[PDB]
Paper text:
The 12-kDa [name]-binding protein ([name]) is a ubiquitously expressed peptidyl-prolyl isomerase with considerable homology between fungal pathogens and is thus a prime candidate for future targeting efforts to generate a panfungal strategy. In addition to its role as a [name], [name] is a member of the immunophilin family and is the target of the immunosuppressive drugs [name] and rapamycin. Three extended loops, which have been called the 40s loop (between β2 and β3), the 50s loop (between β3′ and α1), and the 80s loop (between β4 and β5), surround a deep active-site pocket that binds both [name] and rapamycin.
As expected the [name] molecule is bound in the same active-site pocket of A. fumigatus [name] as in other [name]-[name] complex structures.
Author numbering: 0 to 112
The structure:
């Protein structure tokens, strides 16, 4: 999927992958391309929970996360068009920003890594 690239860092179980409509549990760290963190669920010590593939989150997550298996650690590199685009996200992300997320897939529906 063109606006997002996934780099596997450590494999999950290689069997359970999120599908459109699933609810996933994720720990993440987002950085801008200058290397600076803009947000982290890890530092916040709270897991992030959301439906995937239904537009609840940026396109880059919706298209990137279903490519990971349960337990996988990856990096999702997201073009502005698949992120917050020209506007950015007021108070956090400048307009026209590539987003780089470290993502750990901790849960899919009832299943847990
Ligand atoms: C009631 C409060 C808000 C409510 C916030 C929470 C549940 C708390 C939860 C931990 C979010 C974080 O709170 C510390 C914080 O996460 C960021 O820092 C971040 O790392 C980020 O980019 N994420 C979060 C992880 C998934 C990818 C992306 C996202 O898709 O986030 C989603 C997002 C912003 C979608 C927009 C929606 C508007 C569209 O126009 C735009 O389309 C381009 C896309 C978030 C999760 C929404 O679904 C839910 C919310 O908005 C945002 C920079 C701002 C966000 O706080 C606001």
């Amino acid at each position: 999927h063109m606006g997002v690239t996934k780099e596997l860092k450590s494999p999950g179980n290689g069997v359970d992958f999120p599908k459109k409509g699933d609810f996933v549990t994720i720990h993440y760290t987002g950085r801008l391309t200058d290397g600076s963190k803009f947000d982290s669920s890890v530092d916040r010590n709270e897991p992030f929970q959301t439906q995937i593939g239904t537009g609840r989150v940026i396109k880059g997550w919706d298209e990137g996360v279903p490519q990971m298996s349960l337990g996988e650690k990856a990096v999702l590199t997201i073009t502005p068009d698949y992120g917050y685009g020209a506007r950015g996200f007021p108070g956090v992300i400048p307009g026209n920003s590539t987003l780089i997320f470290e993502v750990e897939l901790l849960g899919i529906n009832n299943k847990r890594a």
